[PDB]
């Protein structure tokens, strides 16, 4: 079972599908313009982990928008068994990123031991000063008294076309999805009889 279980903290307009279509990418005259909504779904995406076996690990993340539509049930999907992704753009990185605190705390309430990584999508939405304005605020409020740890990492991406920033996104995923284990867990990709 070479699959990682995950959940997203973000909302419509951040750009998660924008990133994904250039990760979990297809052919010509298929993928197009992006939109957003709220409901419950999930997406399966391979991670290029090893130089001799790149195709061996896959992410499976639950997709929903950070609205009361999911938030009211969100506390019941919480577990150390899930890894978390956070997706905001580079304007939101300063202005709205903050929106996930009530979600992060539901995660915390069960386990804050599992990592969360924040990606700043739509890098080009903001200028260098604003991008730094986001970064320089986010990375200062990360750790606290009540048990919420600092984010494990962060990355900024231009997501609408083929992109090296997505390659960097992937590199980040490769490391965290490889380095993180829940106790000395059997690697999920092992002979585990369901
Ligand atoms: N052109 C452009 N659109 C973006 C970008 N990032 C975010 N958006 C928009 O944000 C929306 C995607 O929202 P999403 O994060 O996937 O929310 P979800 O429906 O809850 O998963 C789409 O309308 C995208 O066009 C970007 O890189 N540039």
From Swiss-Prot:
Protein modification: Ubiquitinated by TRIM1; undergoes 'Lys-48'-linked polyubiquitination leading to proteasomal degradation.
Residues the entry annotates as binding GTP: 10-17
Subcellular location: Cytoplasmic vesicle; Perikaryon; Golgi apparatus membrane; Cell projection, Axon
Tissues where this protein is expressed: Expressed in pyramidal neurons in all cortical laminae of the visual cortex, in neurons of the substantia nigra pars compacta and caudate putamen (at protein level). Expressed in neutrophils (at protein level). Expressed in the brain. Expressed throughout the adult brain, but at a lower level than in heart and liver. Also expressed in placenta, lung, skeletal muscle, kidney and pancreas. In the brain, expressed in the cerebellum, cerebral cortex, medulla, spinal cord occipital pole, frontal lobe, temporal lobe and putamen. Expression is particularly high in brain dopaminoceptive areas.
Residues where Phosphoserine is found: 113
Top-level taxon in the UniProt lineage: Eukaryota
Linked pathology: Parkinson disease 8: A slowly progressive neurodegenerative disorder characterized by bradykinesia, rigidity, resting tremor, postural instability, neuronal loss in the substantia nigra, and the presence of neurofibrillary MAPT (tau)-positive and Lewy bodies in some patients.
Domain remark text: The seven-bladed WD repeat region is critical for synaptic vesicle trafficking and mediates interaction with multiple vesicle-associated presynaptic proteins. It also mediates homodimerization and regulates kinase activity.
Subunit comment: Homodimer. Homotetramer; when activated by GTP-bound RAB29. Interacts with PRKN, PRDX3, and TPCN2. Interacts with VPS35. Interacts (via N-terminus) with RAB29; this interaction is direct and stimulates kinase activity. Interacts (via ROC domain) with SEC16A. Interacts with APP; interaction promotes phosphorylation of 'Thr-743' of APP. Interacts with MAPT. Interacts with RAB8A, RAB10, and RAB12. Interacts (via N-terminus) with RAB32.
Protein name (record): Leucine-rich repeat serine/threonine-protein kinase 2
Organism of derivation: Homo sapiens (Human)
Gene: LRRK2
């Amino acid at each position: 079972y070479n699959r990682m279980k995950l959940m997203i903290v973000g909302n419509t307009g951040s750009g998660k599908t924008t990133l994904l279509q250039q990760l979990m990418k297809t052919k010509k005259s298929d993928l197009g313009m992006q939109s957003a909504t709220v409901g419950i779904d999930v997406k399966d995406w391979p991670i290029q982990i090893r130089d001799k076996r790149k195709r061996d690990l896959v992410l499976n993340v639950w997709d929903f928008a950070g609205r009361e539509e999911f938030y009211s049930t969100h506390p019941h999907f919480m577990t150390q068994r899930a890894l978390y992704l956070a997706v905001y753009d580079l304007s939101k990185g300063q202005a709205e990123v903050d929106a996930m605190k009530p979600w992060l705390f539901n995660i915390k309430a069960r386990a804050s031991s599992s990592p969360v990584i924040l990606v700043g999508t739509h890098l080009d939405v903001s200028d260098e000063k604003q991008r730094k304005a986001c970064m320089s605020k986010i990375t200062k409020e990360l750790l606290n008294k009540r048990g919420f740890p600092a984010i494990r990492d962060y990355h900024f991406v231009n997501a609408t076309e083929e992109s090296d920033a997505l390659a960097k996104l992937r590199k980040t995923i490769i490391n965290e999805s490889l380095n993180f284990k829940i106790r000395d867990q059997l690697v999920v990709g092992q002979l585990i009889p369901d």
